[PDB]
Design a protein around this ligand. Sequence first.
Ligand SMILES: [Mg+2]
Ligand SMILES: [Mg+2]
Ligand SMILES: [Mg+2]
Ligand SMILES: [Mg+2]
Ligand SMILES: [Mg+2]
Ligand SMILES: [Mg+2]
Ligand SMILES: [Mg+2]
Ligand SMILES: [Mg+2]
Ligand SMILES: [Mg+2]
Ligand SMILES: [Mg+2]
Ligand SMILES: [Mg+2]
Ligand SMILES: [Mg+2]
Ligand SMILES: [Mg+2]
Ligand SMILES: [Mg+2]
Ligand SMILES: [Mg+2]
Ligand SMILES: [Mg+2]
Ligand SMILES: [Mg+2]
Ligand SMILES: [Mg+2]
Ligand SMILES: [Mg+2]
Ligand SMILES: [Mg+2]
Ligand SMILES: [Mg+2]
Ligand SMILES: [Mg+2]
Ligand SMILES: [Mg+2]
Ligand SMILES: [Mg+2]
Ligand SMILES: [Mg+2]
Ligand SMILES: [Mg+2]
Ligand SMILES: [Mg+2]
Ligand SMILES: [Mg+2]
Ligand SMILES: [Mg+2]
Ligand SMILES: [Mg+2]
Ligand SMILES: [Mg+2]
Ligand SMILES: [Mg+2]
Ligand SMILES: [Mg+2]
Ligand SMILES: [Mg+2]
Ligand SMILES: [Mg+2]
Lengths: 147, 187, 105, 75
Amino acid sequence: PSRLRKTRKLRGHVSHGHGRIGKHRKHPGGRGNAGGMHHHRINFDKYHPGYFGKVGMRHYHLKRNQSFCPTVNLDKLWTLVSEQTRINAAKNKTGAAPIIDVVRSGYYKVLGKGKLPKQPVIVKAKFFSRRAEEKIKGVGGACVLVA
Amino acid sequence: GVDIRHNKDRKVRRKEPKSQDIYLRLLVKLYRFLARRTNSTFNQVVLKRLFMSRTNRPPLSLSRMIRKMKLPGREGKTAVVVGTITDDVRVQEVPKLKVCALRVSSRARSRILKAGGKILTFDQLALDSPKGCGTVLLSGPRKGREVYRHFGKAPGTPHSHTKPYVRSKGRKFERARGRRASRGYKN
Amino acid sequence: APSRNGMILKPHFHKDWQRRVATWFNQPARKIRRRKARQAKARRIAPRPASGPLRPVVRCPTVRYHTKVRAGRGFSLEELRVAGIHKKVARTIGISVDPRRRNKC
Amino acid sequence: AKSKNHTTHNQSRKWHRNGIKKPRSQRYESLKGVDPKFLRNMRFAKKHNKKGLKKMQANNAKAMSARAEAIKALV
RNA sequence: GAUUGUUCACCCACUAAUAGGGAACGUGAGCUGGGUUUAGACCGUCGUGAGACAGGUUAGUUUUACCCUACUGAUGAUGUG
RNA sequence: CCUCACGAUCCUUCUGACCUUUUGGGUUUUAAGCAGGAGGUGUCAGAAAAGUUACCACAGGGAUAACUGGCUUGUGGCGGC
RNA sequence: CAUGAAUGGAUGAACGAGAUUCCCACUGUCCCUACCUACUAUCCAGCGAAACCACAGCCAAGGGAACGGGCUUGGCGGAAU
RNA sequence: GGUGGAGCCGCCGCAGGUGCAGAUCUUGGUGGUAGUAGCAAAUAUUCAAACGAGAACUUUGAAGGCCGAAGUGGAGAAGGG
RNA sequence: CCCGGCUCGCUGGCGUGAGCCGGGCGUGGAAUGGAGUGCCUAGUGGGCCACUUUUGGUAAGCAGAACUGGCGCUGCGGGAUG
RNA sequence: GCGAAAGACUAAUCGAACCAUCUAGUAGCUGGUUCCCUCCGAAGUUUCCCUCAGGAUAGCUGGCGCUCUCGCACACGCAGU
RNA sequence: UACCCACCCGACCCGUCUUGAAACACGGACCAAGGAGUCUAACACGUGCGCGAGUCGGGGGCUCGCACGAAAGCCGCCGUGGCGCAAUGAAGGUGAAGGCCGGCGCGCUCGCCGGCCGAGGUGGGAUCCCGAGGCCUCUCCAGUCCGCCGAGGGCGCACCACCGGCCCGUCUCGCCCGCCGCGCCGGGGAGGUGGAGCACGAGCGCACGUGUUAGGACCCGAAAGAUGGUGAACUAUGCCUGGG
RNA sequence: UAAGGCUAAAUACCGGCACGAGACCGAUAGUCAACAAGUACCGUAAGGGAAAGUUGAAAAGAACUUUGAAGAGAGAGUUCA
Ligand SMILES: [Mg+2]
Ligand SMILES: [Mg+2]
Ligand SMILES: [Mg+2]
Ligand SMILES: [Mg+2]
Ligand SMILES: [Mg+2]
Ligand SMILES: [Mg+2]
Ligand SMILES: [Mg+2]
Ligand SMILES: [Mg+2]
Ligand SMILES: [Mg+2]
Ligand SMILES: [Mg+2]
Ligand SMILES: [Mg+2]
Ligand SMILES: [Mg+2]
Ligand SMILES: [Mg+2]
Ligand SMILES: [Mg+2]
Ligand SMILES: [Mg+2]
Ligand SMILES: [Mg+2]
Ligand SMILES: [Mg+2]
Ligand SMILES: [Mg+2]
Ligand SMILES: [Mg+2]
Ligand SMILES: [Mg+2]
Ligand SMILES: [Mg+2]
Ligand SMILES: [Mg+2]
Ligand SMILES: [Mg+2]
Ligand SMILES: [Mg+2]
Ligand SMILES: [Mg+2]
Ligand SMILES: [Mg+2]
Ligand SMILES: [Mg+2]
Ligand SMILES: [Mg+2]
Ligand SMILES: [Mg+2]
Ligand SMILES: [Mg+2]
Ligand SMILES: [Mg+2]
Ligand SMILES: [Mg+2]
Ligand SMILES: [Mg+2]
Ligand SMILES: [Mg+2]
Ligand SMILES: [Mg+2]
């Protein structure tokens, strides 16, 4: 609201919070980000390092859907499944290893972060990490690829 | 005719919750009482926390609450958080806990009760142990906010890595004069 | 004139925006103009699927939307001389006909 | 339009208003700046402290029981 | 008094003497406008040129007081029944 | 022998990896990257740049002259030992 | 310093509200002012503006943003015109 | 208290085109100046009567005067309506 | 600080050295005072004066530095006035 | 445009008309910037800049906090010494 | 206290730029009404609230002629999607775990097989726990209840300092490889170094404040530039026709 | 599958006809315009362009007497005023 604004408390104050030596003229610095090279260099160079200049390689008409690839960590794999299918395991005495279709929960890749519960699994994904391979293998379980 | 600097004689700390929620103002009325009376510094910290801001009493995940209760000796005590208990999907072996908090997210509420645990509020905690006897005070990581990354020396000063504010990160967004030794210099 | 660690902020107001600003106070009244049409059309064709003709099952193109399935534009021609429905007749029995779908599978 | 060209006039006041601070020094300062052949070695010294923990633990109980005997022989 | 826009200068002549200065380098709603110092022009020098020249030369609007004060005169004024 | 003898972005060129991209596959050119040098900004943290205005204009400036006034008194004048 | 030949040189009758110098005649330009006339101003009946105005309106000296009306110390101050 | 003649405020919350001495501010109003400057370009009016509430200024008569036919006289164009 | 012991791809005739683990021991000059640390951030970026030091200048209420103090930002008693 | 030429004249306007719009053109530059009380309280310096009437960054300032200490017979730390 | 008057002391006219204003600096005759930091978008931090590894919000949809409604409510829409949940490389691309033990390859600080623990350690660390010993209590002693003080000893959040470790880029150096193919194939190691990284999370949405911008942008202010138009009734010439 | 063609629906509407509403303005505000307003008026013309709302409830809007040339008064009357 206008009610709680410092512009109320600046009534009867001549300069209105802008100082009477150097008044609030219109545009003293420049207009916008203007003068990155000249006379604003200390800012752009000490707060935005790497602003000015080209780098890398042009890829004209990029489309994100080509390179779309979400990721899961093994940290939260048994979250994609209802936790009861995990409780209907570590039990059942048969080596059930329920199937987890990482594709169905919207992830085209499984990465190897975090601990994994000592439990057999079948993980269907598109692209695996190497360590995510070894974490599932070493727990006892398979890595199954899907197209 | 005295010659002290009155610069920083007034101490800037919160002595009342800046919020208006009557509930927080009520158990503040409770530990405005306990804190003055009982010798326990416990509630003097609990009181001095009930004032603080959301941004200053961060949420405590449930797993960080386990490994701080698993330590040798603090078995049988109660976890006490002036804050909220969140859930941790990346943890499953939930031991039985006795927790107190202002809030407990609904999911973490069912993980705790299902494990044969108990959750209290800061008024039953006043009746359990008014002195705070047999408790464990905890908190979430206050240097956890993503804000704390943009703080520090500066980005672009020598070997002081601090995240800069960029409208959107990418190839052509701040990898130039100052970042690659090939283009100007680098720090 | 920047000050002390903001963003770079290229905002697009240099051109002339004040003139061509489109406010949306029609928004709740348009919700109602459409609602009557939606109803007045259903009452006009009384026994008929109000939603419209039947559309076919169809898969989304790019690899990111691989696994979803949509309602397509219309049933293809190759589809139709399998079920035995003449292409001009189906347009009259609430079957969307798309004469433009290459069936590959 | 000539102007003053320099001065350190009340500068002593300014940078002594917050009271020039000798840099707060902790124990365990950073090893960055030490010659690599030191670290490239002392990291191997630190990495294999554990291989040889059995000697350390038993030899600790030896002096711990010899000085539990030294404090009991005084008693 | 002669010359000079001149201050300054030089001479003629007289005289007792032709001392030196200040007053916003006294004094433009007191004057004059000759000189500087707009616009017009003319030469010389300089500049490729527009033009420049404490280098000359001729032509070029000089407003307002009835207000307060000061001053000059002019009535008066309280007191003295 | 020590304290000076030098140069960003962009652009251009040269050099290096059996490098990467060159886009629906594949092979060759070609081009784009990556990493180092060079081509240069002497106003040397780096605009691509001649005048004149006495026909002039505007924003300002007593932060900046041309009068007066102050301080000073070399110089000028006047006067001592 | 720094003239000069169609960026024209040298002359020159007539002409010029062109620029100077001298002489005769003339004169209140002047020595040195005087009076006379008309219209004003002046007073009255009638009618009646404007620029301007922080507050205002007697001086010396002092200080002071280095020349005050006001401030300090003196001098002084008598209605309405 | 008064005049005035139809609506208005207290508290808890919300919203602003929200508080004026000033901008050579804008619009309107009003002073001081001041009953002051002024009603001075082309020589000139006077007597009697009439009318009238009222006559320096109208009208009639008488007298003195000026414009003096390149007019202050007699008719037109454009313009005015 | 003082002992005891482990580790090393460095260093070396052995030892150095550093790193670790384990024990053994408290006020180490006077005077003062609660300290530490992180976020946003306005105004400012014409200055002037005095003691002392001092550079141009003959000198300046001149130009230019040091050190502190003021004035600007601040009235009161005093210096008549400032 | 027109000029026997002065940058003259072009409807009180001319070194480049008047009218409406683009237009609230831009301004590192003048001017102004509206109620009280309470607490804290500066700078005119640093480096870079077509920088020298401006900015950028340093400082100096305030606000917001937090981490602890223990005058709760039972303190470490700092300092214009 | 406010009206008039009197006295003693004090006392220069305000606004402003300014090193310095009562200034022989500028604005201001007087009085009324008007009159200047706004809205939008985008960030940033602080703060409040909801939910919390999620959380929305829009557009749609389902419910009205609105009185209050162009509101409120509801929708596998609620996730199509944004932001977050993961980085790093120019890019092809890769992608956050280690410890320990036993067993097997020669433990070779190398490679493989079975079991255990799981985010490492050091120093401070608010601090809870345990507490030797005291301190009384009407007796000598006995003794369980209650606390106060409490040397000393333990766990140790948050955070800070440091040492380790892992991911990616690059380098160096060196070893063994796996084999749906052949190795100008792919794969692992040790050591250093670049990174806006991980090292059991903190975001999302909604408010409000402050600040910075883009916007006419706190209000007023140019000399100009551009696009279209209207003028020779003045005056500048030429022409036509009259007059002197 | 180009070099030929047709097409409803969601979509846009500061003009127009006809409506409805408002955390809007309330006569220097709100459109220039609450009224004979794009009117009066200015400019040759393109164009520019105002000011100005309120008696009472009902005109019951002051008959009559009187002073005055008349404007204006004094009484009276109307009115809740
Ligand atoms: Mg103030
Ligand atoms: Mg100002
Ligand atoms: Mg549909
Ligand atoms: Mg003079
Ligand atoms: Mg004079
Ligand atoms: Mg004069
Ligand atoms: Mg002359
Ligand atoms: Mg001339
Ligand atoms: Mg010649
Ligand atoms: Mg020449
Ligand atoms: Mg091809
Ligand atoms: Mg000239
Ligand atoms: Mg000329
Ligand atoms: Mg000056
Ligand atoms: Mg002088
Ligand atoms: Mg007179
Ligand atoms: Mg009424
Ligand atoms: Mg309003
Ligand atoms: Mg007002
Ligand atoms: Mg005559
Ligand atoms: Mg006639
Ligand atoms: Mg300044
Ligand atoms: Mg000076
Ligand atoms: Mg200025
Ligand atoms: Mg000055
Ligand atoms: Mg003066
Ligand atoms: Mg001025
Ligand atoms: Mg231009
Ligand atoms: Mg076609
Ligand atoms: Mg009106
Ligand atoms: Mg009114
Ligand atoms: Mg109006
Ligand atoms: Mg009225
Ligand atoms: Mg009225
Ligand atoms: Mg009345």
